Design a protein around this nucleic acid. Structure first.
Lengths: 304, 410, 332, 64, 325, 64
DNA sequence: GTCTTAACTCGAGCT
DNA sequence: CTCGAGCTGC
DNA sequence: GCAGCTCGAG
DNA sequence: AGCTCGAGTTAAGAC
């Protein structure tokens, strides 16, 4: 949870044919882990060359267009699959589940590397955008910005220097271009509060998430109210088996790190407009892992 | 000594089913294979044919029919330090099924009786007097078969992932990474799906929906799950897929996880006398939600002072989104200063004299007036500080709104 | 030195969806604001005219089957009332580092593969593959049915750098052979640029714009969207056209499949023309799969032999193997 | 049990059908297969009302 | 050499939607900017005109029904108050390569089919089919009910090459026989152009515009869309039109070689000679004239049927469809 | 629950009604039917506000 | 050991 | 056929 | 205040 | 009422 010195803002990154499932029990915007690992991989290639550190990733969803068709029998939607090529045996292919959608997102990269001062911020931003374009986010291609209109540059702002007046003016300037989309943040406080609140009824955790994320109706009539948009998210992966050396796990794509069988862990996230947040750094998602216990979560602790 | 009332009963209950298709030519070679089998041999097939299948709760197959991997049944882990909630909070109701050959599935139904009338799942690994006194089978066979009945609940004896296992990398704090090979949570999936079976089209839930339709109030609560998504995983055939999936419809329901802008609208706001009107489903729903709390008493001074404050924050933010999607005439003129039309740089003074230090901040008062025309001006709370404190809430919210407005282009 | 159980290659030359619009050929050069083509619904009434299963001895039964026609609601896309030119716009990127494997179990295998790739590049460059791709881009092979029955097809490729400046080229699909690849200065330049991008220059962006003359009110053929779930009730659409931003388009993969149609070295080579670069030389439309595994031309066999046994296959086979590696997939 | 047997090119279509009045669904399925005038048609069994009971593609097994 | 389980032929002679408008017959020479015919809704009552079950037909049952009438909403399109001429505009293209299969499982079958087609073309050209198609284009058969009860119908078929009008044609549907095909210089020229286009000698684009005199405020019969509301008309861009398939069906009314020789006359080219209105399908499979039997014999067994049957087979291939198994 | 029971010649009209204050709609429907003062009037049930809850024609059943 | 098709038995409508 | 709920008489 | 009775929907 | 058909279900050859 290190304090980020500066923040790099990718203005707009479009994606086509991304991964829309992102979870066994949910579907929609990709898991935040995908973005954290994305920033990590960027640091993995450019971070060493430029000697910079990237740990914080901010998420602003500008546009979401799925590939779904609503059936006439029920109100539950279905996804639009693709056609697999013919098998070698010549028989028809087997249909497999997949998802695709168009996601236009803007990312905020927290720069913790001290080397930023040694290079121009604008040049660093341009170099990062160039690598970002060739990278593939969420499982689909990242379409660069090419159209009739002028391109959108990347703006880097230093948050260490300047008076509170200048800091607030700069933060306001950033929010002006990030207004069309809504940000994503994890709220586990309300979840635990409700767990203790409803503990008397039954000690069920999944039941509370299900009940909170639905249109609840009480007998009187009225519909239960929620303070903001609340949705389940894949908070992380809990360890399901003990660690095994890289040799023990067959078909591992890498022998450098050991493999561990994990499961899915949920949480409760909230979509909040950028203007509500005062400090952007608290918005950035930071991945924290424990070697002993298999709990790995991307929740942003600084938001609270 | 009632175990025999389950083993010798279930098998006898089973043999009687093996008689529906059994002729005098089959009743001979099946008499000792069923009748005497109910005693010792019907289980002999199991302990000999239990290694064929494997009871588990998290499997790899769901991600591809061709893939092969290692299925796991054991889940004692539960490291949820803050509200976190998943497969690690079941404890009981762990409904588990088997993975392997499709030839033998009732063999597992016999093992499935490990809770059918007693704590036999605890006796499936202990309580030998249950099998050595009631079942009266030898410890060299019975408890040895009990091991093969426990071996069915552990790995085959080797760990392995696959090239389609959907692995990932994963970073660590200042050190090198570790990679996970996640799997499918069948047990939690089935728990959720039973919940959904019970609530979506239950009996009591359907009755509550009927009560909502008839506008009749009774002591029951019902909820609606919308915008579910269907995943036809495991292929067209239930066989070659998780047995629990085969027992169920074979389609896994996914709860919606879209952002508030999933179902976008066709931007058309060039109605011009209707500047603050701007009515859409979210807007009118927020207005109805406010007016529904406007019909409350001050007995909830705090409760109605936050939900309604947060609600008006939502409203002003939605107006900001309106303005934004617009950016990308008199009634729209002051709005032309709030809703800056195109960031017009063409006009010399109309864009640098009528907009440079001319952010018509009266638009906030226009919107306050539209709201007062939306939420009724009921003086019931205007006499006391209820509606006056509501006005103060509105005032400070619109003040922050104007503070954010001042710097559209300045 | 065994093979790697896990092999994957990120696809290269990955295009995006192809947007469509309509307009006048006269304004095509000067106007790029053409309005998009909106999907529409239509009804069709049918008389069963397929083959027969029952004995063809039933006259009155057949008459009754006629009197019971078929009805279905479909989706079609037609140009505006006054529009004779079709426009398709899709971007294309060249990532590079094709030979670079995304994931490999063994390091030795990965190094050996890279060495073989370097040897191939030194002996001969990807100029052949780049030129073939150049032909596909120049002609309208990516278009499937819109090209058929066209007066003039004009393709314009612009290499989008950070800024608008680009080495814009212009070709003619009709003049260029569909089943024959010929060399040209512009084609060679484009192939060189593609080869550089593939080698890993760092960034490549190509904006492709096509203009096809069909006719007023003609019917375009976008990619039908699959569902896999029919439905439990009546009154549905038996044909759904893919549309994004309330505009019809073609799937990215369907375009990327046509662009990589360079496998002309198949064993039969008896009447068949260009074929899609796929493992096992599979073809969906024809329903047959050339290059079965028993022979040695199979991708898996060729790669395993050329890596482990160091058996250099024919130059043609080497090109095919590199093309497959570019397409990507799962091996081992 | 009155069942309406229909034939169509595509699974999604509307066409009249004969009333079999058979005892069970299995009967209607076998009846439709035995009495079929086309190869590419999709047999669709439906009750007297508008609810679809089941459908069967030419190259696939019965599905509900 | 068995047949191929998968056979498909892309349709040739594929027209577009047919838009409609109104105007004055005098201004016929210049017909542009004419306002389109907009569909409208009108309340309409009904009554008991259908057949009653003589058992269910009882004295008081009628008094009840007629005292409880079935209202209904329908859509009709009528010309303006003062308008006597209907206009229809639809384009037509000639692709060619009729015999060329789009998809075939076996290569041998495709080659055999192409060889037979080449032999047929060499022996005799498509002039017969083109000449027959020319009659349908010249006459107003594409129109279904608008033609009935018309004073004067004038069709104008232009030729568009590189955006210019290569050659125009003006005919009279009434003068040309509907059930009889007569030779004419203009018809022959049009047939030649169509034959060339099908053979692949060059692009062919035809803009067809018809003007029929019906009467002031008359009611046109556009193509009814699939189904309170009984009748729904197909409107494109707030204008009435006729379906593409409905026009391509009429343009192919070239089957007159049936084994009955009844007075019905031209029949649309459809496998099994099916007719919806008449409700009977000529050329049943028991006889040898069926398309499927003819093609199987003439390809696999090399049995050349009569020249007429060959024409019918070529028409079927032009129409396209799904064959095999 | 305040429900306004009205009688009118045509479904579209504005005539005052008595406030029943019944618990559920079924009660209001039975009360409206038992209290109908005319044959050809069209019963229209509405809440305290101007929102139309349901209507019933003379020779037709309740609709929502 | 494994999954597949061809085989078994099974049930319901014509003549 | 059986099933709710407002009014009036004790 | 209370409860038998009527009426009209399912 | 014999026989036909197809649905449901079985188990052994081959990978």
């Amino acid at each position: 949870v290190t304090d980020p010195e500066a923040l790099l803002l990718l203005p707009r990154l479009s994606i086509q044919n991304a991964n829309a499932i992102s979870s066994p029990l949910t579907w929609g915007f990709p898991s935040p882990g995908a973005f954290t690992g994305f920033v990590h991989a960027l640091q993995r290639r450019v971070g060493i060359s430029l000697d910079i550190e990237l740990d914080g990733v901010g998420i602003v969803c500008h546009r979401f267009e799925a590939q779904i068709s609503q059936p006439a029998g029920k109100r539950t939607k279905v996804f639009n699959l693709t056609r697999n090529p013919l098998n070698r045996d010549g028989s028809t292919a087997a249909i497999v589940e997949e998802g695709r959608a168009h996601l236009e997102v803007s990312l905020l990269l927290g720069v913790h590397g001290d080397g930023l001062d040694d290079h121009p911020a604008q040049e660093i931003a341009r170099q990062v955008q160039e690598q970002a374009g060739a990278m593939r986010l969420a499982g689909g291609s990242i379409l660069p910005w090419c159209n009739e209109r002028f391109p959108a540059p990347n703006a880097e702002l230093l948050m260490l220097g300047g008076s509170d007046e200048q800091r607030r003016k700069n933060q306001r300037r950033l929010t002006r271009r990030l207004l069309p989309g809504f940000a994503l943040v994890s709220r586990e406080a309300l979840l635990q509060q409700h767990l203790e609140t409803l503990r008397t009824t039954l000690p069920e955790a999944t039941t509370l998430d299900a009940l909170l994320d639905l249109c609840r109706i009480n007998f009187e009539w009225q519909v239960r109210d929620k303070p903001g948009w609340l949705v389940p998210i894949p908070a992380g992966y809990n360890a399901l088996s003990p660690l095994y050396l890289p040799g023990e796990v067959r078909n591992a794509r890498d022998r450098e790190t050991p493999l561990r069988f994990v499961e899915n862990l949920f949480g409760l996230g909230e979509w909040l407009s950028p203007h509500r947040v005062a400090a952007l750094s608290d918005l950035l998602w930071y991945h924290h892992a424990e070697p002993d216990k298999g709990l790995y979560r991307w929740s942003t602790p600084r938001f609270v | 000594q009632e175990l025999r009332q389950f083993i010798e009963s279930f098998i006898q209950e089973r043999l009687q089913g093996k008689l529906d298709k059994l002729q005098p030519d089959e009743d001979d070679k099946r008499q000792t294979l069923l009748a005497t089998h109910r005693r010792e041999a019907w289980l002999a097939d199991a302990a000999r044919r239990v290694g064929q299948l494997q009871l588990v709760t998290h499997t790899l197959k769901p991600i591809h029919p061709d893939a092969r991997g290692s299925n796991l049944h054991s889940l004692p882990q539960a490291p949820g330090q803050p509200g976190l909630a998943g497969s690690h909070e079941l404890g009981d109701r762990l409904v588990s099924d088997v993975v392997g050959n499709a030839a033998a599935l009732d063999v597992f139904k016999f093992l499935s009786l490990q809770y059918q009338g007693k704590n036999l799942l605890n006796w499936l690994t202990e309580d030998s007097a249950e099998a050595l006194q009631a079942l009266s089978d030898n410890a060299e066979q019975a408890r040895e078969w009990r091991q093969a009945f426990i071996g069915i609940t552990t790995v085959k004896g080797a760990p392995a992932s696959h090239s389609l296992a959907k692995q990932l990398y994963f970073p660590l704090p200042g050190s090198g990474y570790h990679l996970l090979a996640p799997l499918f949570p069948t047990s939690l999936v089935h728990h959720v799906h039973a919940l959904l079976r019970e609530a979506r089209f239950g009996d009591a839930a359907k009755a509550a929906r009927e009560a909502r339709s008839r506008q009749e109030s009774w002591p029951h609560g019902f909820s609606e799950y919308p915008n579910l998504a269907i995943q036809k995983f495991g292929g067209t055939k239930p066989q070659n897929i998780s047995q629990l999936n085969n027992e169920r419809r074979g389609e896994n329901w996914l709860l919606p996880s879209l952002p508030p802008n999933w179902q976008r609208q066709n931007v058309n706001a060039p109605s011009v006398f209707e500047h603050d009107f701007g009515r859409t489903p979210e807007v009118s729903r927020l207005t109805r939600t406010l007016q529904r709390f406007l019909a409350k008493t001050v007995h909830n001074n705090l409760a109605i002072r936050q939900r309604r404050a947060q609600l008006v924050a939502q409203i002003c933010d939605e107006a900001l989104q309106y303005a934004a999607r617009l950016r990308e005439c008199q009634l729209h003129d002051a709005e032309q200063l709030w809703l800056d039309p195109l960031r017009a740089q063409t006009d010399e003074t109309f864009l640098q004299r009528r907009l440079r230090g001319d952010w018509p901040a009266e638009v906030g008062n226009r919107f306050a007036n539209w709201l007062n025309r939306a939420v009724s001006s009921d003086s019931q709370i205007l006499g006391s500080p209820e509606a006056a404190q509501w006005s103060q809430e509105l005032s400070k919210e619109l003040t922050m709104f104007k503070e954010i407005l001042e710097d559209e282009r300045d | 030195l065994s093979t790697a159980s896990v092999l994957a290659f990120e696809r290269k030359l990955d295009p995006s969806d192809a947007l469509m619009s309509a307009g006048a050929w006269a304004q095509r050069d000067a106007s790029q604001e053409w309005p998009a083509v909106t999907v529409r619904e239509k009804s069709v009434r049918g008389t069963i005219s397929n083959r027969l299963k029952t004995k063809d001895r039933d006259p009155a039964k057949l008459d009754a089957s006629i009197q019971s026609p078929n009805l279905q609601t479909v989706d079609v896309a037609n140009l505006p009332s006054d529009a004779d030119t079709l426009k398709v716009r899709f971007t294309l990127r060249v990532l590079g580092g094709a030979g670079t494997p995304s994931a490999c179990n063994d390091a030795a295998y990965r190094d050996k593969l890279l060495q073989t790739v370097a040897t191939y590049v030194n002996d001969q460059g990807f100029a052949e593959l780049a030129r073939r791709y150049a032909h596909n881009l120049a002609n309208a092979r990516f278009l499937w049915r819109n090209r058929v029955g066209a007066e003039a097809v004009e393709v314009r490729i612009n290499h989008i750098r950070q800024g608008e400046v680009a080495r814009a080229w212009r070709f003619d699909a009709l003049a260029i052979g569909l089943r024959d690849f010929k060399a040209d200065a512009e084609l060679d330049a484009l192939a060189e640029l593609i080869a550089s991008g593939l080698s890993g220059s760092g960034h490549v962006l190509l904006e492709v714009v096509a203009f096809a003359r069909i006719g007023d009110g003609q019917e375009v053929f976008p990619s039908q969207e699959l569902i896999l779930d029919k439905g439990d009730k009546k009154g549905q659409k038996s044909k759904t056209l893919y549309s994004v931003r309330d505009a019809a388009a073609i799937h990215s993969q369907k375009i990327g499949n046509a662009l990589r149609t360079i496998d002309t070295w198949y064993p039969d080579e008896d009447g068949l023309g260009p074929i899609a670069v796929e493992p096992y030389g599979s073809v969906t439309s024809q329903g047959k799969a050339y290059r079965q595994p028993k022979q040695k031309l199979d991708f898996y066999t060729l790669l395993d032999n050329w890596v482990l046994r160091d058996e250099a296959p024919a130059v043609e086979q080497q090109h095919y193997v590199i093309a497959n590696l570019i397409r990507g997939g799962v091996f081992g | 049990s009155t069942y309406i047997i229909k034939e169509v090119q595509n699974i999604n279509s509307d066409r009249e059908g004969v009333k079999v009045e058979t005892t069970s669904l299995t009967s209607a399925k076998r009846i439709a297969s035995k009495n079929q005038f086309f190869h590419g048609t999709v047999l669709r069994i439906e009750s007297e009302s508008g609810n679809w009971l089941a459908y069967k593609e030419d190259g696939k097994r019965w599905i509900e």
